[PDB]
Ligand binder design. Structure first.
Ligand SMILES: CCNC(=O)[C@H]1O[C@@H](n2cnc3c(N)ncnc32)[C@H](O)[C@@H]1O
Ligand SMILES: CCCCCCCCS[C@@H]1O[C@H](CO)[C@@H](O)[C@H](O)[C@H]1O
Ligand SMILES: CCCCCCCCS[C@@H]1O[C@H](CO)[C@@H](O)[C@H](O)[C@H]1O
Ligand SMILES: CCCCCCCCS[C@@H]1O[C@H](CO)[C@@H](O)[C@H](O)[C@H]1O
Ligand SMILES: CCCCCCCCS[C@@H]1O[C@H](CO)[C@@H](O)[C@H](O)[C@H]1O
Ligand SMILES: CCCCCCCCS[C@@H]1O[C@H](CO)[C@@H](O)[C@H](O)[C@H]1O
Length: 315
């Protein structure tokens, strides 16, 4: 229960990269006026949620790995808060995919259908679903009725306290039957379905060229969605597949602790790549990113630049 320092520090690294990249995304929309359109509300939402994952969710996740002494229901609330915030991250990422779906399939009415007000509707829905799902264990679907005294004793916890571990407060059936399907499998299948429809649009345009600018938009879009989906599956499936193994094999010895830490960390790394890489693949975002990091360097190197120039003067 002591914990692994290697895990803690790698987990801390991800939090920083998640905050850096997504502040970068949001900063870029505030400065650049070209980036201030409806389509980017979905990108800003996702970036905002990823920040909260770095600031709030990952620090909370670190705590839950240590098995510190606390009231079971306090421990459950922290685990639930990790679930809500990561869920919002997933759902707001889905919103980007549904947006691109409408944009490519119904390009005419898109501008009349996907308005700034309706975009905030969708954003709110993302957060309603996140709370409803991640807080579900609060309503009674939890392991707090059956505390572990033997483990609580070994950690030297006072009476009425337990070792705060994730798998000790959050039930595996909740994780497997509700959380995995609602939060991971459905969104993944929906996003994969969106990618397959954009790909097929590109294939139809390409087949027409076998007889003598929309094709470039669709090929770029399909690539962007392949990245999102590929990364999302690589980041989220290992941890949840592990959870299924744990649930369906109660007699099996538990999956190694190093694999657990790797999978948890892997799931958190979705908040640094999604949707940074997506935004980074729009030139307008990419150029604005340069102006910001540029101005950060021509203002941090100044003490050493002035020193070197003065050192050469009297050389
Ligand atoms: C909405 C999906 N959220 C999660 O799965 C997060 O919950 C936590 N989590 C999920 N399964 C486990 C587990 N078996 N052990 C510890 N934490 C977990 C991780 O921080 C995940 O990123
Ligand atoms: C997790 C936190 C959720 C953050 C969501 C931020 C949504 C900002 S929308 C944006 O706000 C501007 C003024 O602020 C208005 O000028 C625009 O018309 C309007 O579209
Ligand atoms: C929970 C259901 C919420 C309904 C969906 C719309 C959310 C609007 S929030 C609020 O609305 C103002 C105008 O309505 C915007 O200008 C602000 O930027 C925004 O912060
Ligand atoms: C530690 C506490 C951190 C929790 C942060 C939650 C941020 C909520 S943003 C808020 O969500 C609403 C629906 O809940 C939407 O209707 C609005 O558009 C949006 O402004
Ligand atoms: C709206 C109020 C609804 C109340 C929700 C109760 C549903 C609990 S199901 C049952 O709860 C046990 C708690 O003792 C756990 O041990 C088990 O894992 C789980 O199968
Ligand atoms: C808000 C509460 C919503 C639903 C709570 C009850 C969910 C239990 S499902 C079902 O329970 C059985 C034993 O009870 C087992 O087959 C597994 O543990 C699980 O598959």
């Amino acid at each position: 229960i002591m914990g692994s320092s290697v895990y803690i520090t790698v987990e801390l690294a991800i939090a920083v990269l998640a905050i850096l990249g997504n502040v970068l995304v949001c900063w870029a929309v505030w400065l650049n006026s070209n980036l201030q359109n409806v389509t980017n509300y979905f990108v800003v939402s996702a970036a905002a949620a990823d920040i909260l994952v770095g600031v709030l969710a990952i620090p909370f996740a670190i705590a839950i790995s240590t098995g510190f002494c606390a009231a079971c229901h306090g421990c459950l609330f922290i685990a639930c808060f990790v679930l809500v915030l990561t869920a919002s991250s997933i759902f707001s990422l889905l919103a980007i995919a549904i947006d691109r779906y409408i944009a490519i399939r119904i390009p005419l009415r898109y501008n009349g259908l996907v308005t700034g007000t309706r975009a905030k509707g969708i954003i709110a829905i993302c957060w309603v679903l996140s709370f409803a799902i991640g807080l579900t264990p609060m309503l009674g679907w939890n392991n707090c009725g059956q505390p572990k005294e033997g483990k609580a004793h070994s950690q030297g916890c006072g009476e009425g306290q337990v070792a705060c571990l994730f798998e000790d407060v959050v039930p595996m059936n909740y994780m497997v039957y509700f959380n995995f399907f609602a939060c991971v499998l459905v969104p993944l299948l929906l996003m994969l379905g969106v990618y397959l429809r954009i790909f097929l649009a590109a294939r139809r345009q390409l087949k027409q060229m076998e007889s003598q600018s929309t094709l470039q938009k669709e090929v770029h879009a399909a690539k962007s969605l392949a990245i999102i989906v590929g990364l999302f599956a690589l980041c989220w499936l290992p941890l949840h597949i592990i959870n299924c193994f744990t649930f369906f094999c109660p007699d099996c010895s538990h999956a190694p602790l190093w694999l657990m830490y790797l999978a948890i960390v892997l799931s958190h790394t979705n908040s640094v790549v999604n949707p940074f890489i997506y935004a980074y693949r729009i030139r307008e975002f990419r150029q604005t990113f340069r102006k910001i990091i540029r101005s950060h360097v021509l203002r941090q190197q100044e003490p050493f630049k002035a020193a070197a120039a003065e050192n050469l003067y009297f050389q």
